[PDB]
């Protein structure tokens, strides 16, 4: 399985977004006989540098290891010097925008589905002992109206204060359990249709509030069972948090309950 791609197979489209290292484009990956495949193209501002190249291509290295229907897929790589990472395109874009715009077109069942799908991706990473460290609505991508996928593994295992677990803020401890806390904040974001947590609150006051037992309130229309799951994700003691395996099974049930 060779990930090196011929540049002539790639057609660059417009700029779609930005990363640490440069502009992200949409585009096309072309193959003989095949249909034209839409793709995302990560660009590297200073790929002439060995230093800058390494951290850039590290995300691709990290994606290389994963294979899951709700995690964005590495298509390939071009190491010739306009260095490019070719990723699967999620044509509907970032989840937060999607939820803000498509609010009156979505139902509670679609929101729980996204949460379930993401829990599915997170269990899978949990089984590989991979910690994402940046679970948030902005980093989730919409592949279809019934399909979200987790992206942006700039931060990895093997600062987003308002999403972080207390032991990550206090002691730089990053684990599956701290991912669970973040997922809980992400679920709140989904149910709030892409409102940010702790608006009008300073990053440095976030820990104080969390230490005082404060938690994001129950979104309008959120079912009590679901909010109950979210508060469990926000146990101060990381050992009382459910694992992504537990969450996935609970979200399945809650989703079925809401469809019925």
């Amino acid at each position: 399985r060779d990930y090196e791609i011929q540049r002539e197979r790639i057609e660059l489209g417009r700029c779609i977004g930005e990363g640490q290292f440069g502009d992200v484009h949409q585009g096309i990956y072309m193959s003989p006989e095949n249909p034209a495949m839409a793709v995302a193209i990560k660009t590297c501002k200073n790929c002439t540098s060995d230093s800058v190249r390494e951290k850039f291509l590290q995300e691709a290295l990290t994606m290389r290891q994963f294979d899951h229907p709700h995690i964005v897929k590495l298509i390939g790589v071009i190491t010739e010097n306009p260095v490019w990472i070719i990723m699967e395109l999620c044509t509907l874009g970032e989840l937060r925008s999607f939820l803000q715009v498509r609010k009156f077109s979505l139902d509670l069942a679609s929101l729980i589905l996204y949460a379930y799908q993401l829990s599915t991706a997170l269990a899978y990473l949990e089984s590989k002992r991979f910690v994402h460290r940046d679970i948030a609505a902005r980093n989730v991508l919409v592949s279809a109206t019934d399909c979200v996928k987790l992206g942006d593994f700039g931060l990895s295992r093997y600062l987003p204060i308002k999403w972080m677990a207390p032991e990550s803020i206090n002691f730089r401890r990053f684990t599956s359990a701290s991912d669970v806390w973040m997922f809980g904040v992400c679920m709140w974001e989904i149910l709030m249709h892409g409102v940010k947590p702790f608006q009008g609150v300073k990053n440095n006051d976030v820990i104080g509030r969390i230490e005082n037992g404060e938690r994001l309130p129950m979104p309008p229309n959120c079912p009590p069972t679901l909010y109950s799951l979210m508060t469990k994700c926000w146990a101060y003691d990381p050992s009382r948090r459910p694992r992504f395996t537990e969450l996935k099974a609970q979200l399945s049930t809650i989703l079925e309950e809401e469809k019925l």
Side-chain angles (χ1 to χ4, degrees):
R1 174 62 184 182
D2 186 358
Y3 285 92
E4 290 285 338
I5 293 188
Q6 293 302 103
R7 197 171 299 272
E8 298 77 9
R9 300 211 163 200
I10 300 301
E11 174 141 297
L12 269 191
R14 69 194 55 156
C15 177
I16 281 301
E18 299 78 39
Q20 267 186 111
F21 301 89
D23 295 326
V24 174
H25 296 255
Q26 63 182 16
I28 297 299
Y29 170 50
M30 291 168 204
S31 157
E33 198 64 29
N34 281 36
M37 192 206 167
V39 291
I41 317 284
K42 317 252 277 161
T43 264
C44 196
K45 199 186 170 296
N46 292 325
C47 51
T48 41
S49 179
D50 295 317
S51 171
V52 185
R53 255 184 60 245
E54 281 320 288
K55 182 54 204 285
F56 175 65
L57 290 167
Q58 193 60 58
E59 177 162 294
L61 282 168
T62 308
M63 299 313 145
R64 198 175 172 177
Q65 302 293 132
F66 307 134
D67 179 21
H68 189 276
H70 297 293
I71 290 174
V72 174
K73 192 179 165 276
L74 179 69
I75 304 314
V77 150
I78 307 193
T79 47
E80 181 203 338
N81 223 333
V83 169
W84 293 346
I85 295 173
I86 318 300
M87 306 301 278
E88 144 197 26
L89 188 60
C90 298
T91 47
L92 301 182
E94 293 183 36
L95 183 62
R96 287 190 66 240
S97 299
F98 188 72
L99 296 168
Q100 283 164 23
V101 167
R102 299 286 293 164
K103 181 139 68 269
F104 285 90
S105 304
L106 288 173
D107 63 3
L108 178 60
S110 298
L111 301 181
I112 298 165
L113 174 75
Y114 307 145
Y116 175 64
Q117 290 179 339
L118 293 166
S119 72
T120 261
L122 293 171
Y124 169 94
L125 291 174
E126 184 178 81
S127 70
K128 313 223 171 268
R129 257 143 220 131
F130 186 89
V131 173
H132 188 280
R133 296 171 164 194
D134 204 3
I135 313 290
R138 71 181 174 277
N139 285 326
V140 180
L141 292 178
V142 184
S143 184
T145 58
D146 66 358
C147 189
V148 294
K149 300 184 190 241
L150 190 67
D152 289 326
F153 299 48
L155 294 51
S156 287
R157 170 82 197 248
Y158 291 136
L159 65 181
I161 293 291
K162 313 247 185 96
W163 284 260
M164 281 167 66
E167 78 277 5
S168 303
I169 295 166
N170 290 147
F171 313 116
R172 297 158 70 231
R173 303 231 62 248
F174 298 92
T175 59
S176 279
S178 66
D179 280 344
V180 161
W181 185 291
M182 299 188 113
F183 181 62
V185 173
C186 190
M187 289 196 279
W188 185 90
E189 283 189 280
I190 290 162
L191 290 169
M192 293 295 291
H193 289 109
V195 167
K196 282 181 182 172
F198 303 107
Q199 275 212 129
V201 185
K202 301 208 230 78
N203 280 350
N204 294 343
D205 292 310
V206 167
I207 194 64
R209 294 212 189 182
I210 307 256
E211 318 267 67
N212 285 351
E214 294 175 30
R215 298 294 186 268
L216 299 162
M218 194 186 332
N221 268 83
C222 172
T225 308
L226 185 52
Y227 185 60
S228 159
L229 199 59
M230 295 174 199
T231 70
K232 310 270 193 86
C233 293
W234 304 321
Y236 190 85
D237 180 355
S239 64
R240 305 178 88 180
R241 287 168 212 156
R243 296 146 171 124
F244 279 113
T245 309
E246 297 173 277
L247 291 170
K248 179 195 185 184
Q250 310 263 48
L251 285 169
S252 181
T253 294
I254 291 165
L255 172 61
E256 292 313 286
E257 256 164 349
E258 179 54 33
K259 288 157 95 172
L260 311 184

